[PDB]
Ligand binder design. Structure first.
Ligand SMILES: CC1=C(O)/C(=C\N=C(/CCCNC(=N)N)C(=O)O)C(COP(=O)(O)O)=CN1
Ligand SMILES: CC1=C(O)/C(=C\N=C(/CCCNC(=N)N)C(=O)O)C(COP(=O)(O)O)=CN1
Lengths: 381, 381
């Protein structure tokens, strides 16, 4: 039995065709090439500027990309080397302030593990409550919770809140003095475009927002996670941050600031979303007619991953992933995302898209052949 | 608030001052031995792409084992790789709490070691750094039955206290005899004067241990760092579980870049690449403070850390007040009381001045520091 999704992902790192973890590792495209050709420029940029100036410069470049004037305005933020570090500091804050916390389900499981490790009193809430107004109202009205930890858009389902859904969420939390923790790790893949920072700040609620470069720009896990919070909790949030970190890397900030700038210059679609679409189509076309059904609906966004229903095969997720491993292919069994109800959700695997290009395409062809060979060996049984 | 609550808070404030001698992160200029690395950053970007994460983890660990000439470290696969040394300490603290280990922490110590253990809920007691050099005092500590784990820093920051081989062997013998777990922070290892194989001694003894390494105080890579966390076989499963709650991995680019810095240091020697410049800077600040009434902390048993620990008793000023006066002259130093994390009020007579700052800022700032010190003292008379 696996302890966690990360245990599976670590094992996957040793496989020929690794589709387990969702960290961005695709090849540098035509537009980002110039950045690698000029690494020395960003090394020099880091040397020539103060740590506070580089922090603000990256934050503001990101605010320009997502067109949030509210984020551009605020100085209440810190810079972590990883998004999991931002999540963990938030969990330390929730425990310190004694906030009973409802955590979205499904979720990448280390969100639950970090909250649990920090001593947070955790309960589950269905991601679909973000799209059902009175299901959400009952959750926040119960007097059972003081905070709501969500992921938007959500991993692995691509569930994404509309502007009106997000406004309703903030209004309900405001009326019940509920703190919102908002994990925006997959923001750039979303289909929506509204200023969620503006809605949060104008409401007056306490909140933390977590951003991440690591699922989006392929920088070999040299990452930046912005952790942004309301004025009223900034002193304590910053104190907890400083127990761990003095700062992140000025080199990493200068480098990632340019990745963000290039994405702004050529747009999201040409630099990120079109590639995700093409790789999505590759898997869909490969699995057509096999009985494996890619999860899809009208409302979801396209994450850098595919959520696949394998129920037609008669295997559960852990079983099927074990067979694929004998063919040098590593996938993520899906049950762990349903961290409060794993055994009711054993029919899915997750396959990540943003892998090294040659490995990815060769690997999907091997995956199609392995599925074929696995199912035909099952006809002989 | 009006006062300082942590060394990191003072260091953050110091980031905005013209002459910042506060934090101890390596920020000196790239010397002639390292310039070829920066001139060819693309080579290490490419190397990170060309190797799997586990194989680059091992390649860095092995290159470091070569530099420190430890066949034991070279042999072991029980280790994880963190982006910062603070992350490694935090995971160790989480392990101490999970395993219900009453922990004696060295005093003095850089204060976030104390803060992290306290934040994780560890049951903390202080022990005098001088116990490491007095056999009877250490034996009383481990045989009391009041502790289960001993957290030490060797060589110690800010005093430069360093264990001899026979002193280290005695420590391990005594902890073994009382089943005390050793947590060994070797952040400043490369500055020590000794050369023995501590990994061999720990492995041979059979005790439970974690060793923490760091590049950040030694090689100037703009806080793009690597921290090896190496541990005994018997605790490897649980240590790796806690690591994997927070990290999948660190950066392969970071590992490739830092591996070269290590390799070059091993090729040309730690004196030519590191220690010689440290000597020049220590002599520089020693000559500047001579005859001021400020007493540089010194003895014939310490090693030379990249920092200067200074008794300001003769000023009549306490450390925070004196640091406040220097700030008025655009000079940031570290008040020493927070290093005595269990007894701050009894140790207010020291400041710490870091040495490995950008070259022109350092030598110019020592001149400004001498002038500010002279002017502040003349006004008292
Ligand atoms: C919604 C969300 C995630 O899905 C997520 C991570 N997802 C992963 C790999 C996690 C690897 N394991 C770990 N970080 N302990 C995935 O494969 O989708 C993180 C943290 O990102 P970092 O791993 O710290 O860079 C934050 N929010
Ligand atoms: C013995 C030791 C230290 O002295 C130390 C840090 N010393 C510092 C700056 C710490 C800045 N603040 C922080 N990490 N929250 C000094 O100025 O000496 C660390 C952690 O290293 P990192 O800061 O995480 O890179 C581990 N072991």
């Amino acid at each position: 039995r696996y302890d966690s999704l990360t245990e599976v992902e670590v094992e996957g790192l040793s496989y020929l065709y690794n589709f387990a973890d969702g960290h961005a590792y695709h090849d540098i495209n035509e537009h980002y090439v110039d950045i690698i050709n000029n690494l020395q420029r960003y090394w020099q940029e880091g040397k020539d500027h103060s740590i506070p100036d580089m922090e603000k410069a990256f934050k503001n470049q990101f605010a320009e990309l997502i067109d949030s004037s509210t984020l551009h305005s605020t100085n209440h933020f810190s810079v972590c080397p990883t998004a999991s570090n931002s999540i963990d500091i938030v969990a330390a804050w929730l425990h310190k302030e004694n906030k009973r916390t409802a955590l979205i389900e499904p979720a990448f499981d280390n969100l639950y593990l970090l909250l649990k490790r920090r001593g947070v009193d955790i309960s589950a809430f269905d991601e679909l409550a973000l799209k059902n107004e009175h299901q959400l109202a009952q959750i926040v009205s119960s007097g059972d919770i003081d905070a709501l930890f969500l992921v938007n858009p959500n991993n692995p389902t691509g569930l994404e809140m509309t502007e009106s859904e997000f406004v309703y969420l903030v209004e309900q939390c405001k009326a019940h003095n509920i703190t919102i923790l908002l994990d925006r790790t997959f923001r750039i893949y979303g289909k929506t475009n509204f200023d969620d920072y503006q809605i949060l700040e104008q409401s007056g609620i306490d909140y933390v927002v977590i951003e991440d470069t690591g699922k989006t720009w392929p920088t070999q896990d040299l990452k930046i996670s912005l952790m942004v919070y309301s004025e009223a909790i900034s002193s304590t949030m910053r104190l907890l941050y400083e127990e761990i970190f003095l700062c992140s890397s000025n080199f990493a900030l200068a480098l990632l600031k340019q990745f963000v700038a290039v994405t702004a210059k050529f747009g999201v679609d040409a630099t990120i979303k079109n590639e995700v679409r093409r790789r999505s189509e590759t898997i869909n076309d490969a699995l057509a007619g096999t009985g494996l059904k890619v999860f899809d609906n009208d409302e979801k966004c396209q994450l850098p991953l595919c959520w696949i229903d394998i129920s037609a095969t008669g295997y559960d997720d852990v079983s099927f992933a074990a067979r694929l491993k004998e063919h040098d292919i590593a996938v993520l069994p899906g049950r762990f995302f349903y961290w409060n109800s794993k055994s009711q959700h054993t029919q899915f695997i997750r396959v990540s898209l943003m892998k090294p290009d040659a490995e990815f395409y060769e690997g999907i062809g091997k995956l199609k052949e392995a599925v074929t060979r696995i199912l035909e060996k099952l006809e002989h049984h």
